[PDB]
Amino acid sequence: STGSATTTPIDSLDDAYITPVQIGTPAQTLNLDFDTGSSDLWVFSSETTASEVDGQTIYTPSKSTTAKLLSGATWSISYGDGSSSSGDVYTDTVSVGGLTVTGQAVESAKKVSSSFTEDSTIDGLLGLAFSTLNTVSPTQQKTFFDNAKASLDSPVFTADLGYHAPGTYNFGFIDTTAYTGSITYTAVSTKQGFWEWTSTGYAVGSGTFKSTSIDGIADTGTTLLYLPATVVSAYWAQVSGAKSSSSVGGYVFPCSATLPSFTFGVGSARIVIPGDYIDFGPISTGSSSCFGGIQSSAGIGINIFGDVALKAAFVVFNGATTPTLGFASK
């Protein structure tokens, strides 16, 4: 089997991407944030504290003839950005882009933090990291990909995120029309539950490539590119007036600037992030200070190849017995 679904930016900045997901019978379609950095499929629901729902579409398990309470199961998750959610668990039929899994754990939120409430466009998350990170207790549950894998034509999914435009998540096949040149594959460590890999270096603009190992995660659920402070300083030093602002929480730059590109290495191959992908717009409405899309990972404890980086590539998440990651230009 295969599936193919369009993923759409939630706003004009590509702060996140949403993908429609069918849950239950008859189908209830919710727009979920596909997150290769976590492993829970959770939704706003009829059980979510009413004051914490503001515009989201909810899953109502009592209206699904295939929903079954997973007795005694609870979940609770905290994300890198300080947001969180928790609740109980149903199993139900879940379909993405024509690919159907029966008995998928659908984690129903009883509580969500303010950042989720405040984002009316995201109805929940669909985790695509390794199932070892799934938070359901006392019986850990599998991700949608893990459940689908054996049925797929090939045990892979691909992320093809757009810049200020829709893109595609495919399951079970590699669309050879979706990228240019060849896909370069690179080793993955699953030790921390992530799609963790080692970039071979970087360049800033038309500058020379610096060969250096950068361990980090391919994370569709993180907006920005988080790299070591040395790398980030070297990038922003090429932008007149750019500075790290403690009050804003990272690097900002004059909105009048033209940003240089940023290149990262994948083995001997190179992915080029155009400068415009690094512009996240005014820090507040009407400001001439703009937020940067490349930020320091210092104090995160891990480097994160988030959407800024991934949207410059066609990315293969290869879930073969030994997982790997593939990157192509597009």
Side-chain angles (χ1 to χ4, degrees), residues 125-141 143-148 150-190 192-217:
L125 267 64
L126 190 150
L128 292 167
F130 293 87
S131 295
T132 54
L133 297 180
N134 176 266
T135 76
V136 177
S137 180
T139 308
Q140 187 171 63
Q141 302 293 304
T143 70
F144 175 81
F145 178 55
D146 208 342
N147 282 324
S151 301
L152 295 179
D153 291 359
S154 179
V156 306
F157 69 90
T158 65
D160 179 10
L161 302 180
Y163 167 66
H164 294 177
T168 306
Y169 282 103
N170 290 330
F171 291 83
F173 71 106
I174 289 162
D175 179 355
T176 63
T177 72
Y179 56 87
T180 62
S182 51
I183 304 176
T184 295
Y185 290 87
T186 196
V188 163
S189 171
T190 64
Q192 295 188 77
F194 301 123
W195 292 92
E196 186 174 1
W197 64 290
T198 301
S199 173
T200 48
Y202 71 98
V204 176
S206 61
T208 61
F209 187 84
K210 176 72 169 182
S211 293
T212 184
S213 296
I214 304 173
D215 181 291
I217 66 170

Side-chain angles (χ1 to χ4, degrees), residues 22-28 43 45-47 58-62 64-67 69-71 88-94 101-108:
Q22 282 70 50
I23 309 175
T25 310
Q28 300 179 39
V43 296
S45 76
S46 56
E47 303 180 327
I58 65 168
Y59 170 57
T60 303
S62 66
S64 174
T65 59
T66 41
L69 178 71
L70 184 64
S71 182
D88 53 21
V89 188
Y90 293 82
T91 56
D92 209 340
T93 303
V94 172
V101 169
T102 58
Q104 173 65 45
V106 178
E107 302 174 34
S108 169

